[PDB]
Design an enzyme around this catalytic site. Structure first.
Site, mmCIF file in Angstrom:
data_model
loop_
_atom_site.group_PDB
_atom_site.id
_atom_site.type_symbol
_atom_site.label_atom_id
_atom_site.label_comp_id
_atom_site.label_asym_id
_atom_site.label_seq_id
_atom_site.Cartn_x
_atom_site.Cartn_y
_atom_site.Cartn_z
ATOM 1 N N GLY A 14 0.396 -1.210 0.254
ATOM 2 C CA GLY A 14 -0.132 -0.049 0.236
ATOM 3 C C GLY A 14 0.407 1.151 -0.160
ATOM 4 N N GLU A 15 0.344 1.975 -0.668
ATOM 5 C CA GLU A 15 1.062 3.600 -0.727
ATOM 6 C C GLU A 15 -0.268 4.868 -0.160
ATOM 7 O OE1 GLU A 15 2.591 4.709 -4.111
ATOM 8 O OE2 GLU A 15 4.524 5.420 -4.031
ATOM 9 N N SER A 17 -0.988 9.354 1.346
ATOM 10 C CA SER A 17 0.529 10.436 1.245
ATOM 11 C C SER A 17 1.081 10.578 1.569
ATOM 12 C CB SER A 17 -0.425 11.259 2.452
ATOM 13 O OG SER A 17 -2.041 11.489 1.613
ATOM 14 N N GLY A 19 3.098 8.324 3.293
ATOM 15 C CA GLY A 19 3.663 6.476 3.786
ATOM 16 C C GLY A 19 3.568 5.107 2.673
ATOM 17 N N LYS A 36 4.210 0.488 8.254
ATOM 18 C CA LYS A 36 3.786 1.717 7.860
ATOM 19 C C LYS A 36 5.152 2.378 7.391
ATOM 20 C CE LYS A 36 0.840 5.101 7.883
ATOM 21 N NZ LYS A 36 -0.755 5.279 8.377
ATOM 22 N N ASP A 126 -11.877 10.478 9.526
ATOM 23 C CA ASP A 126 -11.287 10.459 7.829
ATOM 24 C C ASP A 126 -11.898 8.717 7.042
ATOM 25 O OD1 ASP A 126 -9.236 10.215 5.653
ATOM 26 O OD2 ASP A 126 -7.848 9.357 6.114
HETATM 27 N N1 ATP Z 1 -2.260 -3.374 8.520
HETATM 28 C C1 ATP Z 1 -2.585 -3.383 6.825
HETATM 29 N N2 ATP Z 1 -2.840 -4.537 6.232
HETATM 30 C C2 ATP Z 1 -2.620 -4.582 4.816
HETATM 31 N N3 ATP Z 1 -3.047 -3.574 4.128
HETATM 32 C C3 ATP Z 1 -2.886 -2.037 5.230
HETATM 33 C C4 ATP Z 1 -2.556 -1.999 6.082
HETATM 34 N N4 ATP Z 1 -2.453 -0.696 6.873
HETATM 35 C C5 ATP Z 1 -2.475 -0.535 5.328
HETATM 36 N N5 ATP Z 1 -2.749 -0.845 4.367
HETATM 37 C C6 ATP Z 1 -3.208 -0.880 2.846
HETATM 38 O O1 ATP Z 1 -2.228 0.481 2.841
HETATM 39 C C7 ATP Z 1 -3.216 1.814 1.983
HETATM 40 C C8 ATP Z 1 -2.230 2.891 2.600
HETATM 41 O O2 ATP Z 1 -2.418 3.040 4.021
HETATM 42 P P1 ATP Z 1 -2.067 3.766 4.990
HETATM 43 O O3 ATP Z 1 -3.737 4.584 4.606
HETATM 44 O O4 ATP Z 1 -2.176 4.284 6.492
HETATM 45 O O5 ATP Z 1 -1.158 5.195 4.823
HETATM 46 P P2 ATP Z 1 -0.824 6.760 4.618
HETATM 47 O O6 ATP Z 1 -0.124 7.213 3.917
HETATM 48 O O7 ATP Z 1 -1.555 7.030 6.189
HETATM 49 O O8 ATP Z 1 -2.467 7.476 3.942
HETATM 50 P P3 ATP Z 1 -3.410 8.742 3.507
HETATM 51 O O9 ATP Z 1 -2.655 9.516 3.896
HETATM 52 O O10 ATP Z 1 -3.566 8.029 1.856
HETATM 53 O O11 ATP Z 1 -4.711 7.772 3.290
HETATM 54 C C9 ATP Z 1 -4.249 1.195 3.109
HETATM 55 O O12 ATP Z 1 -4.963 1.817 1.799
HETATM 56 C C10 ATP Z 1 -4.721 -0.575 2.457
HETATM 57 O O13 ATP Z 1 -4.875 -0.310 1.418
#
Ligand code: ATP
Ligand code: ATP
Ligand code: MG
Ligand code: MG
Lengths: 293, 293
Positions: A14-15, A17, A19, A36, A126
């Protein structure tokens, strides 16, 4: 690659903003986890806060366990349970829309997660299909819906005295425009009602396949949120929910009308969805569209 | 849900033109598999043929094992090994483009798969990033690239006598317009050269993030393939490959110039990619962009 002393980093899953999330394994027990990575920069969300929040919610149903938080060079890492695809991903596999049965069953779980968070004196802020993930395929919780990403949570009341936060305005627009509540667009302090409204937006998104305010015109960011906000206000609920069970309109109507510091009647809301299932002469089972041919 | 006597159907993991792919498990050994459901209809590809092809390629590196083929009511099912995400999916996780190192390493494996198929007297005819998948995360072959979907293969020569098929025209356009060879657009019988050219199109797609002929104008299907075909002919290779290692232009140039029944010099092609790695002062390892932060 090894981080947190005993976690082996695998491939990206996953990706976001700022992370990147990788699947990995805990070398001591061979358990699968998700790591993450968050760059330590001024405009990035503090991962330690998300860690704190995970601890505060430890034990709640549908909330993944947190294992490690620390710095790895120029990044902060958070190790949590490895989960399955998000509801957004599942949409892609089901023709970009979910049936009434799947939405009602999904709604009951999603609403329960939000209530758990509210009961801990927090507002999520969110709400989006991307933050709701199902369990891993070969697991007992394969069909349980979880909530991840607590980067924008905030306390809406003092946990000890339960004194609610005052109403404030001029707030800067944060999350996903497509799902946010009208109050949010208006720069008002978000409370429990806003989470519930955004959740209603997601439900309608699932049913229709799209929202009336998706993809507007050649505007800029501040113009985007605004044009979208205006479209939300000009779009009638009877219109938004036309063609689907009356309970969906009722949910939207309730959420939209709650007062700033009002305590939601979660039981009433859960009941609406149970009614939907009853009328369908179906029960809350595991036959989601994604398990069906 | 149980099919093929001992295979338990799980959730959807993929969707195609007519078929849906589910992850599942073989109940006798608890092995994970993928089950492809294909509706038995006039305009659908005969799954028995794909089955035959899988058997014919059994044992080749990068080709998944086939376990079962049969009818389940109004569907034909094919049970094969469960694999990981496609290269198209991986693109989404890496900023929609791959670095030179990843493309050169990926190219070597992809080219090897195509050669294996050609050596079995078959032309693939459906080259696209969606049909190349990596292995499962916690596997020894986690970073091996596989080829699935043999719905459009055809024999380009008699397997026994090696007598090549005659050149024919008026052929109806089949696969993905974005990647097909120019000869294909021209309605010419496809041979080994076409697979190699389409593969070059994919490589350039990976490097650039897009092709000059993607998303054209308000045209219809037959107009789409045509406008795209015309754009491919009007796009100079030096232009298409500008900015990247010379070997990419050389690959494109070779593939484009092969004769209809010419036997490709696979070794020469593999060498180009090895040269790319050498210049990068890197080796063929497992550090693909998707395993990197
Ligand atoms: N625990 C996990 N297990 C499986 N997939 C995950 C997990 N955590 C996150 N993901 C996948 O990774 C994606 C991005 O994670 P996360 O939303 O934590 O990143 P972020 O940079 O905080 O996101 P944004 O700012 O895009 O909301 C999730 O939307 C999902 O697709
Ligand atoms: N063995 C497998 N393991 C994991 N994923 C798979 C497997 N087979 C297929 N997939 C996933 O399912 C998708 C569609 O599969 P497939 O291409 O066989 O369907 P199809 O109907 O023949 O496709 P199309 O006509 O779209 O090419 C693949 O592109 C990939 O995303
Ligand atoms: Mg997210
Ligand atoms: Mg395909």
């Amino acid at each position: 690659n090894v981080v947190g002393v005993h976690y082996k980093v695998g491939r990206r899953i996953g990706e976001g903003s700022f992370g990147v999330i990788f699947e990995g394994t805990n070398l001591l027990n061979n358990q699968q986890v998700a790591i993450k990575f968050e760059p330590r920069r001024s405009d990035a969300p503090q991962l330690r806060d998300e860690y704190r929040t995970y601890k505060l919610l430890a034990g709640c149903t549908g909330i993944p366990n947190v294992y490690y938080f620390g710095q790895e060079g120029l990044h902060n890492v958070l190790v949590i349970d490895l989960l399955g695809p998000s509801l957004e991903d599942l949409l892609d596999l089901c023709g970009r829309k979910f049936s009434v049965k799947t939405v009602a069953m999904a709604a009951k779980q999603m609403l329960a997660r939000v209530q758990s968070i509210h009961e801990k004196s927090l507002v999520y802020r969110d709400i989006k299909p991307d933050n709701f993930l199902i369990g891993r395929p070969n697991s007992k919780n394969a069909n349980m819906i979880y909530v991840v990403d607590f980067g924008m949570v905030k306390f809406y009341r003092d946990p000890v005295t339960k004194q609610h936060i005052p109403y404030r305005e001029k707030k800067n627009l944060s999350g996903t425009a497509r799902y946010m509540s009208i109050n949010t667009h208006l720069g008002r302090e978000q409370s429990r009602r806003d989470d519930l409204e955004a959740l209603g937006h997601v439900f309608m998104y699932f049913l229709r396949g799209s929202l009336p305010w998706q993809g507007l015109k050649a505007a800029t960011n501040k113009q985007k949120y605004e044009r979208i906000g205006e479209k939300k206000q000009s779009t009638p609920l009877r219109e938004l929910c036309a063609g689907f069970p009356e309970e969906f309109y009722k949910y939207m109507h309730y959420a939209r009308n709650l007062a700033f510091d009002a305590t939601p009647d979660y039981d009433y809301l859960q009941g609406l969805f149970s009614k939907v299932l009853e009328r369908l002469n179906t029960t809350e089972d595991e036959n989601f569209d994604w398990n069906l041919l």
